[PDB]
Assembly symmetry: C3
Homo-oligomer: 270 residues x 3
């Protein structure tokens, strides 16, 4: 690293570091009720991953959040009957999709990172391939989605912040252009196959994390006095409405569920 | 204007004219049972980001419209499974306040973190409620309609907007309400003219309510305007809920699946 | 009171030394399981916000706290595998291996533009939180009641943190805590479990409006000298749209089915 200017209280520094970016994915999978043959959704969602890779004379504690943008809405409709398998909507990423990966590590450069300019960085290229996801039907066969794969290539880098129930981290966002790779995908036990992209079924595919190495450089505005600290940990209590709305539902449910647990019992008089 | 230039910093007073576009948001939860009972109609923070053409070029502003001190009304047309009901719905009056946080992509919000000497002149606008039909099993649907109030600037302060996508330090425009004429009512129901704005269809087809004005503040902002502040978010909060919900989704599905059988198998006569 | 340490043209490095009265509360999620209504699912702790107004020798103060808990112990009770046997699949209780985090913020001069701080430490009290009573009212039969429980907290450390509410975000101080299993035994009547100390998340508050602790601190906040500069403090949150939706959707399927029953009673 280098120094660029110094006024008593404050300082201007250019941090230049080489990093190892390990990130992961996340997906919400909602099954629909009734018989159990219909699936509601398979969307993507922010995916936090914090690791501790061995560097030089120090073990680098980094944190990432892997987000997705502009994903595509696919679907499968194997019939209008209670028995016809269906996936109302599942997200898949293609060339028109972008992958955002926010990176933050416990080092000196993020120390009091708040104001940055002259920011750029060289990056790798990596290929994330989909695994297997089986749709366990009650009585019958189990159609499994499999395949999917695309490579990501750095487009740009920017300032962002990662919010967890535990911490808030101003970090770097590494935009990504997606390239449809080979391993194409299909659903088994179904009349669909041959089509590219990465579906949100099992994007991680057993792998503990996808990795990308690279380096950057930025000029952050940090105090001359590097014996300071910025509040980093969180304590969140947001969306009380939902908490409530949900708990209220838990109620009506339980009620009805039990409205039965007393109708599915009153009749043990025979 | 440069009130003060310094080494690395710049005490600056930004004075801009802005067009504020905002929206409303409401949670509507119907109650279980026959489907005649409506549980609640509350307000909720409402995000809206527009791109307006300023007399120089275009700008990108974002807003979050919140409500405070709303009044809880209700309607109880009977204790029977067939008597229409609305356990609770929110309606704003003179005693209610509307908060509207504003942020735009311009130079002034660039590194906004510390501000003093903040004030501004603003317009006045009238939001009128639309129509919300209460769907029913039998009979023509009772429709809530009407409602209307004007907002007049009370003050302005420092706030931060929080979306799943972004966190924005911006300005909060407090509002005093003035109960305006269009009184609201519920078709096919004992509730005739009442003044205010119920959270049924606050927007009323309109894509956004608008207000123009200008402001004057002083933002302790560094100098080299090449600098910015982390603006985009990535939220993973309330893991407990996510879990609690999913868990419920389970017990539900379980029972759901467990009944429709003893129902599509009672269909054997 | 307050000492001005250093100072350039726009900033100023100050050391704030204040004495405070910390009043905080607890909070717990209690989920009963479905069915006959004999099975209890969970009793966890959760962040608890509490804001008060106490007079500091000279004036009227406005503080806000958030009481969080870490490393709690998972107990449970299984009095049978039948729809009629009482059960608490999982309830949290705190012991010596548990810590209590209490974030503190007040409307005073010292938190004004608090964002950068060093040379931070403080002396603090010691207080004892005791559990009250929580009854497991059953369809039929004497409601087994959980009662007792108690531990004392002693200051371990203090650090920087941010409190989050649907209303506000406040950079404030986190006061870590070491626990001591105090006198009060917690015990569930009508049942095998009895004679254990510790604090279970049933009724941690125990009617008390708040637990209190007094103390003072020392720090050095990097702030500007023109003290009319405010930091955005109020929130407006719209996070977790996914859940909102997921919930609502469930609300849907439920109502639907719920209706089919009441129509099964037509």
């Amino acid at each position: 690293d280098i120094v660029v200017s110094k006024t008593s209280l404050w300082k201007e520094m250019q941090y230049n570091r080489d990093i190892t970016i390990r990130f992961k994915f996340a997906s919400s999978i909602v099954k629909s009720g009734g018989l159990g043959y219909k699936w509601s959704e398979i969307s993507f969602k922010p995916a936090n991953y914090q690791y501790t890779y061995t560097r030089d004379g120090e073990e680098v504690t980094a944190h990432t959040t892997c987000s997705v943008n502009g994903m595509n809405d696919f679907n499968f409709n194997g019939g209008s009957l209670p028995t016809d398998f269906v996936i109302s909507r599942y997200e898949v990423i293609k060339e028109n999709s972008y992958v955002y990966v926010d990176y933050w590590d416990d080092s000196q450069a993020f120390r009091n990172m708040v104001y940055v300019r002259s920011l750029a960085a060289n990056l790798n290229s990596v290929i994330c391939t989909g695994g297997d996801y089986s749709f366990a039907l009650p009585v019958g066969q189990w159609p499994v989605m499999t395949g999917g794969a695309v490579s990501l290539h750095s487009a740009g880098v920017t300032l962002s912040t990662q919010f967890t129930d535990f911490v808030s981290l101003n970090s770097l966002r590494f935009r990504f252009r997606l390239t449809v790779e080979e391993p194409s995908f299909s659903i088994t036990r179904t009349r669909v196959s041959r089509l590219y992209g990465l579906p949100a079924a099992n994007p991680n595919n057993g792998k503990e994390y996808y990795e990308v190495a690279g380096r950057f450089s930025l000029i952050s505005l940090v105090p001359s006095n590097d014996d300071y600290q910025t509040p980093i940990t969180n304590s969140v209590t947001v969306r009380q409405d939902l908490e409530r709305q949900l708990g209220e539902l838990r109620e009506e449910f339980n009620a009805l569920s039990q409205e039965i647990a007393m109708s599915q019992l009153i009749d043990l008089a025979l």
